[PDB]
Amino acid sequence: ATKAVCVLKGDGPVQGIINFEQKESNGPVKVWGSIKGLTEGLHGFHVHEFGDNTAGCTSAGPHFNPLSRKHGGPKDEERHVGDLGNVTADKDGVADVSIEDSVISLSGDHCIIGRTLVVHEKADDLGKGGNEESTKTGNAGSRLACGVIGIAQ
Amino acid sequence: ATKAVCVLKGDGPVQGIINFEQKESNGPVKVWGSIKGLTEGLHGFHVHEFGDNTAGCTSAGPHFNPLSRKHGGPKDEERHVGDLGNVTADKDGVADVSIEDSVISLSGDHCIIGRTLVVHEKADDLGKGGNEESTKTGNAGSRLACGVIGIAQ
Ligand SMILES: [Cu+]
Ligand SMILES: [Cu+]
Ligand SMILES: [Zn+2]
Ligand SMILES: [Zn+2]
């Protein structure tokens, strides 16, 4: 069924292609692809509200959050729609992303097409950091690369 | 009002920012902004089907055509939904765009969000070129710059 794709680019070396596949209407979405040029280890990874790159990744806005909840990890009921948790880069700085999520969608109210995928400087603390920033952004730091999510075939 | 935005970029100097605004879901869309780095004269300007920039503008596919019609000008009844005609660059290579269109939409089963806006090498002959290429692409030639159309605040 629906497919989407996103090319990640930023001001530094981080870049990559992420694919989205949703076989059934409001079934789970498979998210996979490769991002390079990352530091080894965990990096926050979220869908942000606006597909606006006019000021690089800053104009993407906050995490996509149509239900007005607090930040969390993807396994949590209390999360943003766009909270996809972390991706892990290996010792050569490559993240072979492989996620399945059933809260994002490629259609309807939780649709992420037209919005911005962002990969971050640091790990997402999944809302467990005990400060207000943790339940807003997970303390994942700056936006290293981003791309608008587009319809694919 | 629904709003969208597109940052156009390519392998050459052509780049620009195009805004979209649609006050009513069943009303027209206003399209405006600027593109620079163009030769003076007319340049084809269309929404292509896929918001896939993995091969630059090449992976965007053909003009967005959900109703399976021939290529035309924006004011023709026979047109692709993606056909927005020509933009005009001045002698400084700058095209100031201001279009209103009532066939494209920012919502509904056939909206253009998540698709790719493309500005071309040559003029679009609006499907009146008298050859099979004309009723496919308008003879507008290569794709100089493009971007995925994203949701804006
Ligand atoms: Cu983020
Ligand atoms: Cu085109
Ligand atoms: Zn979040
Ligand atoms: Zn066309």
Side-chain angles (χ1 to χ4, degrees):
Chain A
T2 340
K3 291 173 85 185
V5 71
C6 179
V7 175
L8 289 175
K9 293 170 171 317
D11 289 324
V14 175
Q15 56 162 275
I17 296 170
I18 299 294
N19 306 286
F20 298 81
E21 329 192 3
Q22 188 175 34
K23 71 212 139 47
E24 180 247 66
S25 176
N26 328 253
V29 182
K30 290 189 207 173
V31 181
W32 71 274
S34 164
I35 305 168
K36 60 175 206 197
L38 289 160
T39 51
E40 187 181 351
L42 295 166
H43 294 273
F45 191 61
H46 325 105
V47 180
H48 288 233
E49 190 171 4
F50 309 118
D52 184 338
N53 188 235
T54 55
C57 316
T58 311
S59 40
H63 303 178
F64 179 43
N65 185 21
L67 297 188
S68 307
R69 293 188 187 178
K70 301 123 123 158
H71 184 74
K75 300 162 75 175
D76 296 327
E77 165 142 89
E78 180 76 8
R79 63 171 263 192
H80 298 147
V81 165
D83 291 346
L84 296 181
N86 290 296
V87 294
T88 293
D90 62 23
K91 73 199 173 72
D92 298 317
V94 174
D96 285 310
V97 176
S98 181
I99 280 168
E100 179 178 306
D101 192 73
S102 48
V103 173
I104 52 162
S105 187
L106 302 190
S107 78
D109 289 348
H110 293 187
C111 186
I112 57 172
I113 287 177
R115 307 197 183 264
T116 287
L117 183 62
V118 180
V119 62
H120 284 267
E121 168 189 22
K122 314 201 278 225
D124 186 332
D125 70 20
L126 310 177
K128 293 166 121 193
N131 53 21
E132 239 173 69
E133 194 67 49
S134 178
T135 42
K136 305 187 141 220
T137 68
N139 287 291
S142 77
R143 311 179 179 194
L144 302 185
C146 76
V148 182
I149 302 164
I151 299 163
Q153 58 170 334
Chain B
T2 299
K3 296 178 230 26
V5 69
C6 179
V7 175
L8 297 155
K9 301 165 160 152
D11 299 322
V14 182
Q15 55 199 262
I17 296 175
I18 299 293
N19 307 282
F20 304 79
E21 176 171 307
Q22 192 183 11
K23 285 306 224 151
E24 312 275 349
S25 79
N26 59 331
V29 183
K30 294 167 208 285
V31 183
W32 75 98
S34 179
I35 312 156
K36 58 190 188 193
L38 289 164
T39 51
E40 175 177 23
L42 296 173
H43 298 269
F45 191 56
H46 329 102
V47 182
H48 289 234
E49 184 170 355
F50 309 109
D52 178 335
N53 191 248
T54 58
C57 316
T58 312
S59 32
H63 298 181
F64 178 44
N65 184 23
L67 300 175
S68 304
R69 291 177 186 175
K70 272 158 183 276
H71 180 69
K75 297 320 201 182
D76 297 340
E77 214 294 333
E78 178 75 346
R79 59 174 263 189
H80 302 151
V81 169
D83 291 339
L84 300 176
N86 286 296
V87 296
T88 301
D90 65 18
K91 65 181 187 103
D92 295 317
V94 180
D96 293 298
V97 181
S98 154
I99 289 177
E100 172 179 313
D101 191 71
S102 69
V103 166
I104 59 165
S105 190
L106 299 188
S107 59
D109 111 296
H110 294 155
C111 95
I112 60 176
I113 283 167
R115 300 191 188 275
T116 291
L117 183 63
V118 181
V119 64
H120 281 263
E121 182 189 17
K122 316 196 272 170
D124 186 335
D125 67 19
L126 308 183
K128 320 299 196 320
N131 53 29
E132 269 231 272
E133 190 75 357
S134 169
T135 32
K136 180 220 190 153
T137 65
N139 283 300
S142 80
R143 314 171 176 188
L144 300 188
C146 76
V148 186
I149 297 165
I151 292 160
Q153 175 176 232

